[PDB]
Amino acid sequence: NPNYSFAGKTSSISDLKEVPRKNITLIRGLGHGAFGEVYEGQVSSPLQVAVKTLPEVCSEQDELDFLMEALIISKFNHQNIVRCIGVSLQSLPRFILLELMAGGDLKSFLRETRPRPSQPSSLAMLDLLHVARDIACGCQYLEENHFIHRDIAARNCLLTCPGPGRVAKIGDFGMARDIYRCAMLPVKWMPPEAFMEGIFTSKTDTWSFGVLLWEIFSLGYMPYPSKSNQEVLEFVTSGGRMDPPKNCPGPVYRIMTQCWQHQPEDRPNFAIILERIEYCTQDPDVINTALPIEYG
Ligand SMILES: COC(=O)[C@H]1CC[C@@H](n2c(NC(=O)c3ccccc3)nc3ccc(CN4CCCCC4)cc32)CC1
Numbered sequence: 112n113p114n115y116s117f118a119g120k121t122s123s124i125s126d127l128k129e130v131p132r133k134n135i136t137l138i139r140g141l142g143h144g145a146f147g148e149v150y151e152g153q154v155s156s157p158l159q160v161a162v163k164t165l166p167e168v169c170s171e172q173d174e175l176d177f178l179m180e181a182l183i184i185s186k187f188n189h190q191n192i193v194r195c196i197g198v199s200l201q202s203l204p205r206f207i208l209l210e211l212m213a214g215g216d217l218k219s220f221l222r223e224t225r226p227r228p229s230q231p232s233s234l235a236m237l238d239l240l241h242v243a244r245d246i247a248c249g250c251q252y253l254e255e256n257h258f259i260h261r262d263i264a265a266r267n268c269l270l271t272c273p274g275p276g277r278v279a280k281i282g283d284f285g286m287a288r289d290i291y292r293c294a295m296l297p298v299k300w301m302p303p304e305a306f307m308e309g310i311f312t313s314k315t316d317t318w319s320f321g322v323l324l325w326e327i328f329s330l331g332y333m334p335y336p337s338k339s340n341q342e343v344l345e346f347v348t349s350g351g352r353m354d355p356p357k358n359c360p361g362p363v364y365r366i367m368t369q370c371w372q373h374q375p376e377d378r379p380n381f382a383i384i385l386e387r388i389e390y391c392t393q394d395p396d397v398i399n400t401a402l403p404i405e406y407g
Contacts, residue, residue, distance in 0.1 A: 117258065160196050161208075165204050181198050184209070225330045231404065235398070240397075259287065259311050260287055358401065
């Protein structure tokens, strides 16, 4: 019966909104994340949801991890963090019910929606700046509430829909969950002090957000092209930084390099990041820059 605290308030399993199992219907598989499969579902004009499932074959620790994940997501309240409709923990397999994000994960979206001869203007700079603003807004909410994400990366962000008017949200809190209670650490998203001293602060998430910005403006490339985890660790620790993505406007790259200052005190907080993203968004020289066309 672990307690969870956020924003000075303590909650437990009894605070989660249990939805009767008979009201929940699975429609289709949407793929898998940290735990088992995620399904499209509906709760009884039914409510459309994403259903995160816990494998019935799992450890005591897997169970406790799943519970902590439920508590974490249920206590956030922000438009750029996926909502939790509720849980179904009293039937097996256990479910967490979340806001359905019909556009899928941000990394996949960027790779699949790259401008190409068949879809020549599938995305523009403003689409990318809007995604960046959306995630920066969610990050600012976390920072204001003293929550350190620890894995701000494109794979962990989701889109409401594929089309125009999409909203990007933070959708996975697995790293924070593990720490609340190595070839799997997200080395390529971590600042020098994090992988050395294990020191984490909100300026950790600033650094990671810089890497996310690179992922966005590269249209979904893996950070540090051609470098392994240890090569990145040594590169970053020695002052090495990524080059601008193809066609990236200068003002946008400058946000990245500010996010990647060696000393955490020299990195901007998220209020400043949002200010800078807004300035880029209003600058015609930025938003009129054409994205590269991937040949196809
Ligand atoms: C956090 O990311 C995940 O959990 C992964 C990636 C996103 C996945 N996903 C999700 N995930 C969610 O909506 C979601 C995930 C976590 C929290 C809240 C919502 N929605 C998707 C919509 C479409 C598609 C693409 N579609 C899959 C079926 C066959 C054809 C291609 C994938 C969607 C779930 C699994």
